[PDB]
Amino acid sequence: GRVRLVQFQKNTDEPMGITLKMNELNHCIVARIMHGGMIHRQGTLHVGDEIREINGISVANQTVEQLQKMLREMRGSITFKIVPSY
């Protein structure tokens, strides 16, 4: 699909509300989005989307725990480079 850049503004320390999973090619896939969360309210990131980069950082050959940890500690203006899935 077509790559796009999705931007969020994270000012609080609450869970972003994303659950990730890696598939066979180690592609990072959005497994779940927390209903009513900041992400869900914006409507720009959806289950099945492939995340290629976070804050410009390639997710390649990083584990799920690593990425979730990264997501838990991010604040301010952040981005996901994603390939949406329909």
Curated annotation (Swiss-Prot):
<comment type="similarity">
    <text>In the N-terminal section; belongs to the protein kinase superfamily. CAMK Ser/Thr protein kinase family. CaMK subfamily.</text>
</comment>
<comment type="subunit">
    <text>CASK and LIN7 form two mutually exclusive tripartite complexes with APBA1 or CASKIN1. Component of the brain-specific heterotrimeric complex (LIN-10-LIN-2-LIN-7 complex) composed of at least APBA1, CASK, and LIN7, which associates with the motor protein KIF17 to transport vesicles along microtubules. Forms a heterotrimeric complex with DLG1 and LIN7B via their L27 domains. Identified in a complex with ACTN4, IQGAP1, MAGI2, NPHS1, SPTAN1 and SPTBN1. Part of a complex containing CASK, TBR1 and TSPYL2. Interacts with WHRN.</text>
</comment>
<protein>
    <recommendedName>
        <fullName>Peripheral plasma membrane protein CASK</fullName>
    </recommendedName>
</protein>
<feature type="domain" description="PDZ">
    <location>
        <begin position="4"/>
        <end position="79"/>
    </location>
</feature>
<comment type="similarity">
    <text>Belongs to the MAGUK family.</text>
</comment>
<comment type="function">
    <text>Multidomain scaffolding Mg(2+)-independent protein kinase that catalyzes the phosphotransfer from ATP to proteins such as NRXN1, and plays a role in synaptic transmembrane protein anchoring and ion channel trafficking. Contributes to neural development and regulation of gene expression via interaction with the transcription factor TBR1. Binds to cell-surface proteins, including amyloid precursor protein, neurexins and syndecans. May mediate a link between the extracellular matrix and the actin cytoskeleton via its interaction with syndecan and with the actin/spectrin-binding protein 4.1.</text>
</comment>
